[PDB]
Amino acid sequence: SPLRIFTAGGTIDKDFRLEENGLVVGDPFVAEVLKTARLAGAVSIVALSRKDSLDFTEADREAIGRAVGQAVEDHILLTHGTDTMVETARYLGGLPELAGKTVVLSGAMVPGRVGGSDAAFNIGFACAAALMLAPGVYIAMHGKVFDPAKTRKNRGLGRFEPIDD
Amino acid sequence: SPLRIFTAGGTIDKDFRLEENGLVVGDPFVAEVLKTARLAGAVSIVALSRKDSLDFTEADREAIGRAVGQAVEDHILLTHGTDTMVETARYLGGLPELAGKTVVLSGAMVPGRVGGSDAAFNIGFACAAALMLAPGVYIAMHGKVFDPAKTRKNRGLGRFEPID
Amino acid sequence: SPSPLRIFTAGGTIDKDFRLEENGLVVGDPFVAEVLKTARLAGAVSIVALSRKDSLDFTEADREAIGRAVGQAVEDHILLTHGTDTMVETARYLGGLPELAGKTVVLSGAMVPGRVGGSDAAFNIGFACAAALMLAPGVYIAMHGKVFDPAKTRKNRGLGRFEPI
Amino acid sequence: SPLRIFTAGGTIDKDFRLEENGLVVGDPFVAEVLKTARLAGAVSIVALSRKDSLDFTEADREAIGRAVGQAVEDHILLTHGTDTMVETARYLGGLPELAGKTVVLSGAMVPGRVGGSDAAFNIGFACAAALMLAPGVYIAMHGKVFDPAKTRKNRGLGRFEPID
Ligand SMILES: [Cl-]
Ligand SMILES: [Cl-]
Ligand SMILES: [Cl-]
Ligand SMILES: [Cl-]
Ligand SMILES: [Cl-]
Ligand SMILES: [Cl-]
């Protein structure tokens, strides 16, 4: 397919580890969504890192820039935590190796393995956005496309919204 | 630009009824998917019919053409059963009142209310396709866009594929 | 330390599964195996499939075959998963068999298939397993978080519930 | 015959709060399991406290003893976190107001709102156990009944086991 999928952990991939009575960043949830989507080929993703927003580092962010630049595909999906998605998307937007590529960041406010998740919808929408949008770096959430330069995460209302005018 | 959703029943919307001890075509599952999607914009969901592929008629297919034609929006998602999705899509492609509209048909091989369903992914994918594709009539399934004129449903593989 | 419990499956609503090629439900693999897989059980328990019928296709020959299998079991604690529409008739028939004299036999199932959202199946299986281990010798129906005497019970098909006669 | 159900929080009740990106102890999951169990009457529970195993106190434990002793019912289910369950069960075992009551503690190693949870099976089994066992205090987990004086939680293996 023309699409390459990268994962950088975050809320979307959280799973319960019963040995510590708490969530960890687990197996990439996009693999679980694509498993039941009846795709033509084997499910194929790249798992870059498995951090949550607290232990994600600038080194982890540069590693994403290098992985995406080395991909041969020009249509790119990156699943990520929402708390520092804008920071990653603005960083990728300044990399010249990404000039001709459509790069879409998405994830979920609720882990896929928790009831009532936005994850599967967001993954479908984001896959289609990555295929169909003109070259650029975008955030796809809430069934819409956000310009990362003009967007912030509101942690309190769990949503992306326009920056302060 | 705003999306309008029309529903025509099919597998995607099947639900268990205790008294039938069996499935019936239920409330549109797209509304359940959009509920947990934390949407930025308002989306109208209009139910045109609640049939399965066995009791969906040519009269039902004409009624969908009339409702899509009367829609003010140029971005339309229609949820439908897969067994005759190609026939509906080919019919809508022939209608002059759909010039300038992007109309995407989608649905699910497995009911949304059954474990292991393609429905939520296919709804996300088809919503974006309806917003982003140029005017025309399309089928969005298997994370791909199909041209209805060059596509068929393989019943046994439970897949859409190119003719040839 | 093996469970005193043997589980027999005879099909019914509990086990219904969606088949793509038919665009509808068929009686599938026993849902009790899926529930016990996530139950973290202490004791080994045998699940034996006797039949894969719904209540519409069930015969007097099938019921006689179920009575022979239960009677031949070594265990004195038996769970039988079954459709609800013919449960009372199976339970009354098992109640008449001398080979079942020393045994606790509990029939249960679900009004909604395990594999459909909003199912009573996992609750019913937990309740019925405990009932089969703890009740005095006899034949019982376990549904609605209660124990029913088959001779004094019927299925109200309209209300989708077992009730006193 | 009548069962009284009390909840004290723990793993079974954890729910994701998207405003903090983490789990909190939430609405008692037993209400969700009983909702789909098609019971004869309204689902009725007593929500005593909403601690996890790390914030639960000997005062919270004594408050459960007072609540269970005030119940008119002689069949009692208490949902609880597993890491503190043996100490609660042993404490209730010592209370004279509980002498003629069957008191069953249960819960789940995985929250009910996370996929692949033991919660619904465990509630079904423990409801039956509370109705059927002789007076005493018991832990119902792993499809069997444990004597709390002879039992410990193995945190690493997520299981109750004999001391042994
Ligand atoms: Cl995160
Ligand atoms: Cl259909
Ligand atoms: Cl049946
Ligand atoms: Cl069916
Ligand atoms: Cl806990
Ligand atoms: Cl957490």
Author numbering:
A (entry chain D): 6 to 170
B (entry chain C), D (entry chain A): 6 to 169
C (entry chain B): 4 to 168
What does the paper behind this entry write?
Based on the previously published results for typical class 1 ASNases (Derst et al., 1994; Schalk et al., 2016), we tested two mutants, RrA(Y21A) and RrA(Y21F). Finally, the Y21F variant grown in the absence of L‐Asp crystallized in space group C2 with two complete tetramers in the a. u. RrA(Y21F), also grown without added L‐Asp, nonetheless contained L‐Asp in the active sites of some protomers, presumably co‐purified from the cell lysate. Other protomers contained water molecules, ethylene glycol, and/or chloride ions, all contributed by the buffer. The distance between Thr16(OG1) and Lys19(NZ) was longer than in RrA(wt), exceeding 4 Å in all eight molecules. Although both were less active than RrA(wt), RrA(Y21F) is somewhat more active than RrA(Y21A), which is opposite to the results obtained for typical class 1 ASNases. While it is quite plausible that in RrA Tyr21 contributes to proton transfer from the primary nucleophile (Thr16), almost certainly its side chain also contributes to stabilization of the tetramer. In this role, substituting Tyr with Phe preserves this role better than the mutation Tyr → Ala.
L‐Asparaginases (ASNases) catalyze the hydrolysis of L‐Asn to L‐Asp and ammonia. RrA is homologous to the N‐terminal domain of typical bacterial class 1 ASNases and exhibits millimolar affinity for L‐Asn.
